[PDB]
Amino acid sequence: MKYQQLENLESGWKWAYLVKKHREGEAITRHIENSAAQDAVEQLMKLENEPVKVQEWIDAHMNVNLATRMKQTIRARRKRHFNAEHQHTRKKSIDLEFLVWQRLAVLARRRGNTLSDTVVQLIEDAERKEKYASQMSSLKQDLKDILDK
Amino acid sequence: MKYQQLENLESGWKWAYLVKKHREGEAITRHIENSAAQDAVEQLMKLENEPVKVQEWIDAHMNVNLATRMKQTIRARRKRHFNAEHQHTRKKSIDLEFLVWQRLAVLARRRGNTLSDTVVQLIEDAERKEKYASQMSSLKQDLKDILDK
Amino acid sequence: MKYQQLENLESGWKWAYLVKKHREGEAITRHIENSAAQDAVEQLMKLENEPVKVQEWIDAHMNVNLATRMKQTIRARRKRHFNAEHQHTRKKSIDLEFLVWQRLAVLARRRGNTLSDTVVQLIEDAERKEKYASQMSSLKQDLKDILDK
Amino acid sequence: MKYQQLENLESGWKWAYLVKKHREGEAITRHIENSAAQDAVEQLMKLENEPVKVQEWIDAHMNVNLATRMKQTIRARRKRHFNAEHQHTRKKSIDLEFLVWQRLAVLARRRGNTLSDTVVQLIEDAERKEKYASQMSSLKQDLKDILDK
DNA sequence: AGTTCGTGACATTGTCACGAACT
DNA sequence: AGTTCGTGACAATGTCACGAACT
DNA sequence: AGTTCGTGACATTGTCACGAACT
DNA sequence: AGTTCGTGACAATGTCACGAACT
């Protein structure tokens, strides 16, 4: 584990997640009978501030089908929680026009690197384009002198 | 004005947005009293597919603040609704690393262009600088070949 | 007249020429009857050392058909007589193989000049061929340096 | 031995040469006495087309000196006789100015070659030097063209 | 040894065709 | 226009000097 | 003036697919 | 082999701030 896993903080996240899924209309419970599940949900609503308890609840009453998905969601939020501390470890979200993203994705795939890294290469290559043009004509002139001389 | 406003569709959107905000714990109503407020919330729960009525609610029972926000939320849901019918009108979400996004942003603001228009120029300016190292490598090869013969 | 015409000397030439034609079997006489001509010839044989007389003889008895030819032969011998004084005004006679003369004639015609002059140009061009080869490689090297540099 | 000796032909040649030399005032015979000498001259005048006899005369009545000279004269008339049957075996007579012939002779003696073989080398060595000013003018044009583009 | 033969290099002589110069 | 001249390019014939093979 | 609409720019949150690391 | 983690690439939804036209 690269990031530290704070039991207190994540249990709260898992709680909010399980609660959010419910008001969204999903099966947080593993129980099929609407009685044992209907209750498991009611109890869970109490665990709001009891971390240790939330972990237990999950073990007995949560739908096995949410197990991996939640592991993803919480895993990702953990990362994001700590990357938020310094700006160089943060990510920025932007939208690009379809066609523009397409040209950029193709580039990156072909070069074999990340979208970000590709953008950095583009910025550095595109900046030296001027120092390269003048490098062509300067080279093209010096040669024309080697001939008539 | 560009896209068309389908009253029927755009009304259910406005509804789904109210029931959602309320189930999330926000002041849908503009009545400080929990009496009049709760009174409205119940009605708005049966206006499911009665668009004719849904609007009546907004006009009569809606929180000032939420109104302005719902307005921008809908124009966005609209535009995206119609933009999703053709690829060259769709948008792609990506995430860049902070520092990489900053360098891209600096360029864009500098030139007054959008992030997509800036990626597009960088890609063309870089393809140009690349065609310069090529033509310089082609000339050294074309000339060098004739003298061997 | 560029060369001086010595009456004494040329009359002797004309005499020898007229005598040579006869022993060669020709009509030195203009006379068709073998009597007036047969005699004119006999007289001419006496003029051996009398120049002034030879001129007269020619006027009365020589075949009009030898008139131009002798003018050529004597004209040419005069030139040759004086060109023999200095070696730079002399001509030298040589034989060339058919094919060789042919290549040389073509050259001279095309350039528009004398066989001699053509031979001089050939000798001077063919001598500078070495200074021209080394002028090609030296030029071919200096250029290969302008490239890798 | 190369050419064939046509006794019939080569005999009349020997005859025409004797009657000629005698009509020119030379000692055809080898008899100091004008008696025996003139005796022979008369016989040799009827051997016109009797080759069988013509030779008998040479063996019996011919001036020593003239014999040796007639020998070289005939070998020449022979070789030319047969060389005139095909162009690439014929010879062309030209005249060069003295000084021009001298420069040509110097070269030939130097290289041990004949005058024709020397004209042939000069023509090839000059065509070579010319192909050098050409290739040097072609390269300056080929290179110069690529840099304009 | 001495001589034949072929051959390259000229010398002589004659012509022709061309164009400049003079009449 | 017609003629005289000088001239370049050959041809035709004769010699000579070599040099390699034939006697 | 005040408000609608379209729009570019992000922030949040959730997922998936991938591969390194550990068990 | 099975699982846990960090991670890059998106989607989907909501806001905000502009700016140009509609009221």
Curated annotation (Swiss-Prot), chains A, B, C, D:
<dbReference type="InterPro" id="IPR009390">
    <property type="entry name" value="MatP"/>
</dbReference>
<dbReference type="Pfam" id="PF17414">
    <property type="entry name" value="MatP_C"/>
</dbReference>
<keyword id="KW-0132">Cell division</keyword>
<dbReference type="InterPro" id="IPR035375">
    <property type="entry name" value="MatP_C"/>
</dbReference>
<comment type="function">
    <text>Required for spatial organization of the terminus region of the chromosome (Ter macrodomain) during the cell cycle. Prevents early segregation of duplicated Ter macrodomains during cell division. Binds specifically to matS, which is a 13 bp signature motif repeated within the Ter macrodomain.</text>
</comment>
<dbReference type="GO" id="GO:0005737">
    <property type="term" value="C:cytoplasm"/>
</dbReference>
<dbReference type="InterPro" id="IPR035087">
    <property type="entry name" value="MatP_N"/>
</dbReference>
<dbReference type="GO" id="GO:0006355">
    <property type="term" value="P:regulation of DNA-templated transcription"/>
</dbReference>
<keyword id="KW-0131">Cell cycle</keyword>
<comment type="subunit">
    <text>Homodimer.</text>
</comment>
<keyword id="KW-0238">DNA-binding</keyword>
<comment type="similarity">
    <text>Belongs to the MatP family.</text>
</comment>
<dbReference type="GO" id="GO:0043565">
    <property type="term" value="F:sequence-specific DNA binding"/>
</dbReference>
<dbReference type="InterPro" id="IPR038339">
    <property type="entry name" value="MatP_N_sf"/>
</dbReference>
<dbReference type="GO" id="GO:0051301">
    <property type="term" value="P:cell division"/>
</dbReference>
<dbReference type="Pfam" id="PF06303">
    <property type="entry name" value="MatP"/>
</dbReference>
<protein>
    <recommendedName>
        <fullName>Macrodomain Ter protein</fullName>
    </recommendedName>
</protein>
<dbReference type="InterPro" id="IPR013321">
    <property type="entry name" value="Arc_rbn_hlx_hlx"/>
</dbReference>
<keyword id="KW-0963">Cytoplasm</keyword>
